[PDB]
Amino acid sequence: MNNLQTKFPHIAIKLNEPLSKYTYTKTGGAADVFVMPKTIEEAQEVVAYCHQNKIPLTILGNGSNLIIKDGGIRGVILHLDLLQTIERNNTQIVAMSGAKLIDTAKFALNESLSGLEFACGIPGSIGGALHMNAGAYGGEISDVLEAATVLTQTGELKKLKRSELKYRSTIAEKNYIVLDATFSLALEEKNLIQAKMDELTAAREAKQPLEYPSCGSVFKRPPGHFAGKLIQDSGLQGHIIGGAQVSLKHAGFIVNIGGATATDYMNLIAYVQQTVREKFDVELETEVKIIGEDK
Numbered sequence: 001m002n003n004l005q006t007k008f009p010h011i012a013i014k015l016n017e018p019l020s021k022y023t024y025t026k027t028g029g030a031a032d033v034f035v036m037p038k039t040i041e042e043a044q045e046v047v048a049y050c051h052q053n054k055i056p057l058t059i060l061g062n063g064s065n066l067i068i069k070d071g072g073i074r075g076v077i078l079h080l081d082l083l084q085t086i087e088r089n090n091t092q093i094v095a096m097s098g099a100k101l102i103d104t105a106k107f108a109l110n111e112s113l114s115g116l117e118f119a120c121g122i123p124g125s126i127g128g129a130l131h132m133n134a135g136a137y138g139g140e141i142s143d144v145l146e147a148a149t150v151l152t153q154t155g156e157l158k159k160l161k162r163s164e165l166k167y168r169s170t171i172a173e174k175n176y177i178v179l180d181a182t183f184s185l186a187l188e189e190k191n192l193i194q195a196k197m198d199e200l201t202a203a204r205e206a207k208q209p210l211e212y213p214s215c216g217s218v219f220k221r222p223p224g225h226f227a228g229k230l231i232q233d234s235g236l237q238g239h240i241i242g243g244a245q246v247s248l249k250h251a252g253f254i255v256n257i258g259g260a261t262a263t264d265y266m267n268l269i270a271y272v273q274q275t276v277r278e279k280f281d282v283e284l285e286t287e288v289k290i291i292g293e294d295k
């Protein structure tokens with residue numbers, strides 16, 4: 001409980017670590033117990049330990065899709081940053097859950113493998129990707145997810161196949177901790193994949209603030225409306241609270257113009273939600289995950 005580091009020396013662990021250092025928005029209060037496993041077995045022992053002692057456990061990828069309140073988070077947060085491997089395996093790609101999705105789409109191209117193009121620009125880890133059935137440009141992880149190695153809440157490995165894997169995953173429910181993923185790709189010319197990747201980078205760059213830290217598109221798309229358009233239409237574009245701003249480039253993004261805090265994010269998110277429902281009677285529901293409690 002407080003006793004974890006005792007049982008497992010040799011497992012890189014940290015005390016009361018402020019998470020903003022590891023999050024894509026550069027925000028979030030501290031997490032009381034922060035663990036980074038070098039090994040799969042290490043991940044197992046910790047998951048099992050927390051389960052058995054009923055200690056709430058959270059898995060943090062790169063927080064490119066979450067906001068962590070300044071009250072921080074209770075229990076143990078596991079970050080699988082050290083599980084980084086990416087491998088070639090005939091027409092198939094195997095990547096560990098701590099690998100960056102962008103690197104996995106870079107690899108694919110070096111091998112003349114097609115099917116990942118859609119992810120050359122999606123930030124975050126492979127673990128987050130499977131958890132979110134990450135997708136962009138009509139493409140999606142489920143389109144090419146072959147197999148995954150996972151940890152059940154009790155700590156056991158479970159090797160999954162297509163059948164057992166099923167809009168931004170059966171991984172989400174069933175609360176599996178992804179350890180590595182296998183994508184079924186197809187052989188195709190470098191040039192053709194290149195033209196898609198350039199097309200996609202061009203497209204995304206033209207429309208997204210990639211320069212600023214942010215989570216992604218903050219809201220799910222309301223039936224027959226664009227999040228961004230509503231926001232923009234409600235006069236909220238450019239709005240600032242503390243160090244947070246409804247992006248002047250894409251109104252559905254809240255960028256960090258410097259020193260933003262999770263409080264700032266939650267506050268801007270709520271004010272947008274509130275203003276939008278007053279002008280158009282539409283419920284903007286967050287896409288981005290919200291975790292920790294109120295400081």
Ligand SMILES: Cc1cc2nc3c(=O)[nH]c(=O)nc-3n(C[C@H](O)[C@H](O)[C@H](O)COP(=O)(O)OP(=O)(O)OC[C@H]3O[C@@H](n4cnc5c(N)ncnc54)[C@H](O)[C@@H]3O)c2cc1C
Nearest residue numbers: 061062063064065124125127128129134135136178215216
């Ligand atoms: C500029 C920008 C653009 C973006 N564009 C897109 C886009 O085009 N398409 C898109 O789909 N998303 C997009 N996102 C959101 C984000 O990139 C994806 O949701 C991403 O896959 C999340 O990765 P992560 O590792 O950051 O997850 P985190 O934000 O760290 O957490 C995400 C969720 O996954 C869970 N999780 C994380 N790792 C694991 C693991 N190993 N096992 C199990 N669960 C895990 C977390 O507990 C949490 O529920 C964008 C974000 C930004 C900031």
